[PDB]
């Protein structure tokens, strides 16, 4: 489903994220918790207030995982295998929530990449995040 042009677009956009990947992960989570409050049910052990270091730390982990996916875009099921296991068998997050975080990541990238977020790149990123979500929920059942 990811064409050569899509892969090129994702690497170009994510490359521009660079060293801000962690910061953007945290912002995407905050957007998600405020816009889609039902997602908070998975984090009752967190302080979800703005600026929380628990949220910043988790955003860095999410972003780091996405960086790994980009780097292994042709071999994502393997690169994310342990993360697929963890979500399926321990965290057990309902698959609907991955669409909600994906949307909030897209909004975050749009707000920080004015020149890079063209319609073509937007479509490629949406496809990319849907593929990552598919991989992460592939072992649930």
């Amino acid at each position: 489903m990811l064409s050569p042009a899509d892969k090129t677009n994702v690497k170009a956009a994510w490359g521009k994220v660079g060293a801000h990947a962690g910061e953007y992960g945290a912002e995407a989570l905050e957007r998600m918790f405020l816009s889609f409050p039902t997602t908070k049910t998975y984090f009752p052990h967190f302080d979800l207030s703005h600026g929380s270091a628990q949220v910043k730390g988790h955003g860095k982990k999410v972003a780091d995982a996405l960086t790994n996916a980009v780097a292994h875009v042709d071999d994502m099921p393997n690169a994310l295998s342990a993360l697929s296991d963890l979500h399926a068998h321990k965290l057990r997050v309902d698959p609907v929530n991955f669409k909600l975080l994906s949307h909030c990541l897209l909004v975050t990238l749009a707000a920080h990449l004015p020149a890079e977020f063209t319609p073509a790149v937007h479509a490629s990123l949406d496809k990319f995040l849907a593929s990552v979500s598919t991989v992460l929920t592939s072992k649930y059942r």
């Binding site: 049910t41 998975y42 399926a88 057990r92 309902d94 059942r141």
Partner: protein
Amino acid sequence: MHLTPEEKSAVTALWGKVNVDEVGGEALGRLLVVYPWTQRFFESFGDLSTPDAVMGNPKVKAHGKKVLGAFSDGLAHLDNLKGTFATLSELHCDKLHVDPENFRLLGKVLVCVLAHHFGKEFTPPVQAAYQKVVAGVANALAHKYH
């Protein structure tokens, strides 16, 4: 919740034939088998290792009975689901941390169980009335999330 008189009568007439404890046990068990991520709330229930162990687990049946008994009593207040389930909505959000998508999955499984149980009596128009009801309940249980 708005249902026509004809829809309301179809809901109540079939429900009069239900063994709430049996159907409750069956629906919660199939929920945990068919959508196994829903087991995340129930690790204290013991052995959920196989479909047979889930369906036969006494703690699963007992919770099934509690959940469907509340559903059942809600069927007597179809014009006021939101106010009927307000306190349970607050409980499920603030203390139990249950993603409301689970209410929707239970709704799908319950419809399947009623079809299995009633066969041809579960006609397309009867199903349509129950689809409104299970959507309405799930919406009422999600109402106080924040």
